[PDB]
Ligand binder design. Structure first.
Ligand SMILES: N#Cc1c(Cl)ncnc1Nc1ccc2c(c1)CC(=O)N2
Ligand SMILES: N#Cc1c(Cl)ncnc1Nc1ccc2c(c1)CC(=O)N2
Ligand SMILES: [Cl-]
Ligand SMILES: [Cl-]
Ligand SMILES: [Cl-]
Ligand SMILES: [Cl-]
Lengths: 124, 4, 124, 4
């Protein structure tokens, strides 16, 4: 086609989706990770995670307002990945890398798994 | 705006 | 903070949101523009348009599944802007520029209004 | 990945 493109558009959309999340506006699911709860938008979760994409395209699970993650999942690891989904920013630190990598593998977030593997390999 |  | 950032993340999220729209997955509103209907995600509309941001933060309108636009709004102009919201790509042409600009003014999409004004000024 |  003969389209023009606004470079910052995708980043501006994501910033606004994060602002809606922070104000709990039109959030339609709560992700339960052991004792912790995280409110989010199903569409953002699906757009970022192979696991959520599978869950919310399921004819029964698409209608659930609560999703319980595997008890082995670390809430802080999930929190870091949820923030990444809404911001493109990953708070990767020596103290959380193992939990973040395990959570990203479970959530099927290949690019996060990739950088975790690379950061781990550099430290050995 | 750019030509993509 | 000491975060790392994935450059293509925002673009990949938007591509997936557009894929969900094309397959009518978790779309929660229909925008009626005279004889035409457009299914979309309320959160994407709010993230792109000052008018939809106002509409879906309203305590009554947030719950509506159908939104009827002003009868003066051109469906093709709306279609072009809806595609832009989900892709960052604007199909701006001599034959549609006036309709696109009027629709963008109504929808409160300042960056689109700006490029329409600039393209019009260059042709006079 | 980059340093933002
Ligand atoms: N929403 C949506 C969606 C669609 Cl529509 N099409 C294709 N993938 C989608 N999302 C999704 C699927 C698999 C993975 C990711 C996202 C990140 C990753 O590492 N794996
Ligand atoms: N969703 C959301 C949203 C939030 Cl949370 N905060 C601030 N603006 C939001 N969206 C929005 C408001 C005004 C305009 C646009 C988008 C594009 C434009 O030209 N005007
Ligand atoms: Cl439920
Ligand atoms: Cl990822
Ligand atoms: Cl309704
Ligand atoms: Cl805009």
């Amino acid at each position: 086609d003969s389209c023009i493109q606004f470079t910052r558009h995708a980043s501006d959309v994501l910033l606004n989706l994060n602002r809606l999340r922070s104000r709990d506006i039109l959030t339609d699911v709560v992700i339960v990770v052991s004792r912790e709860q995280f409110r989010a938008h199903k569409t953002v979760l699906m757009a970022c995670s192979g696991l959520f994409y599978s869950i919310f395209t399921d004819q029964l699970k698409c209608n659930l307002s609560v999703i319980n993650l595997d008890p082995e999942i670390n809430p802080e690891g999930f929190c870091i990945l949820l923030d990444f989904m809404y911001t493109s920013r990953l708070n990767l630190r020596e103290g959380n890398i193992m939990a973040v990598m395990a959570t990203a593998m479970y959530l099927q977030m290949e690019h996060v798994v990739d950088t975790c593997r690379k950061f781990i390999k550099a430290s050995e | 705006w750019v030509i993509p």
